[PDB]
Design an enzyme around this catalytic site. Sequence first.
Site, PDB file in Angstrom:
ATOM      1  CB  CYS A  58      -1.001  -0.019   1.165  1.00 51.52           C
ATOM      2  SG  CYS A  58      -0.281   0.019   2.841  1.00 51.52           S
TER       3      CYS A  58
ATOM      4  CG  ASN B 297       4.786  -1.660   4.762  1.00 48.79           C
ATOM      5  OD1 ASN B 297       5.946  -1.883   5.115  1.00 48.79           O
ATOM      6  ND2 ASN B 297       3.851  -2.609   4.731  1.00 48.79           N
TER       7      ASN B 297
ATOM      8  CB  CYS C 163      -3.415   1.300   7.152  1.00 44.02           C
ATOM      9  SG  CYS C 163      -3.332   2.839   8.160  1.00 44.02           S
ATOM     10  NE  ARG C 164      -5.100   0.602   2.031  1.00 43.47           N
ATOM     11  CZ  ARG C 164      -5.200   1.354   0.945  1.00 43.47           C
ATOM     12  NH1 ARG C 164      -6.195   1.187   0.094  1.00 43.47           N
ATOM     13  NH2 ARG C 164      -4.286   2.297   0.726  1.00 43.47           N
ATOM     14  CB  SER C 165       0.576  -3.587   2.720  1.00 40.34           C
ATOM     15  OG  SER C 165       1.328  -2.537   3.259  1.00 40.34           O
TER      16      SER C 165
ATOM     17  CG  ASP D   3      -6.035   4.721   3.045  1.00 43.24           C
ATOM     18  OD1 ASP D   3      -5.800   4.193   4.148  1.00 43.24           O
ATOM     19  OD2 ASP D   3      -5.332   5.653   2.573  1.00 43.24           O
TER      20      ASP D   3
END
Length: 154
Positions: free
Chosen positions: A9, A12, A14-16, A126
């Site tokens: 993301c 690096n 939150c999501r990933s 996000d």
Amino acid sequence: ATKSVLFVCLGNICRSPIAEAVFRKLVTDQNISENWRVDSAATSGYEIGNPPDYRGQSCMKRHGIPMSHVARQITKEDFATFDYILCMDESNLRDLNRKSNQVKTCKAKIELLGSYDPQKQLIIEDPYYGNDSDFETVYQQCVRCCRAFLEKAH
Ligand SMILES: O=C(O)Cc1cccc2ccccc12
């Protein structure tokens, strides 16, 4: 042969890191962690060195998913070494495709993680400006997509 996947993301944090942790749990549960190289990285350099967003860490704790990560930026080497680079949204995909055309060896297949969702939710949105419920949505999507990717890659 070892298989490898890099989740990506923008920052690096939150999501990933959640996708990476979910996937690592899945392969560990099936006794095949040693056959996989699993990592996550950022397209940008804004968060290098930082631990995951505290809201994401809280979400992972709730779900018993082991997560421990230091944010890092993607490198040119990552395109040569990873089999799959799976990203979160259209912005990420555009950036990764730009980067991929600036290296000589691009082994990696670059795809949206959400393209694997059996429930067909293409974008993993996000959660940075969201709340705890948005992190929960991200977690649930990652589980669905990571399971499907492990089952059968495109
Ligand atoms: O963002 C850019 O285009 C430059 C750039 C910055 C950081 C990492 C990279 C990896 C591969 C290719 C380019 C890259």
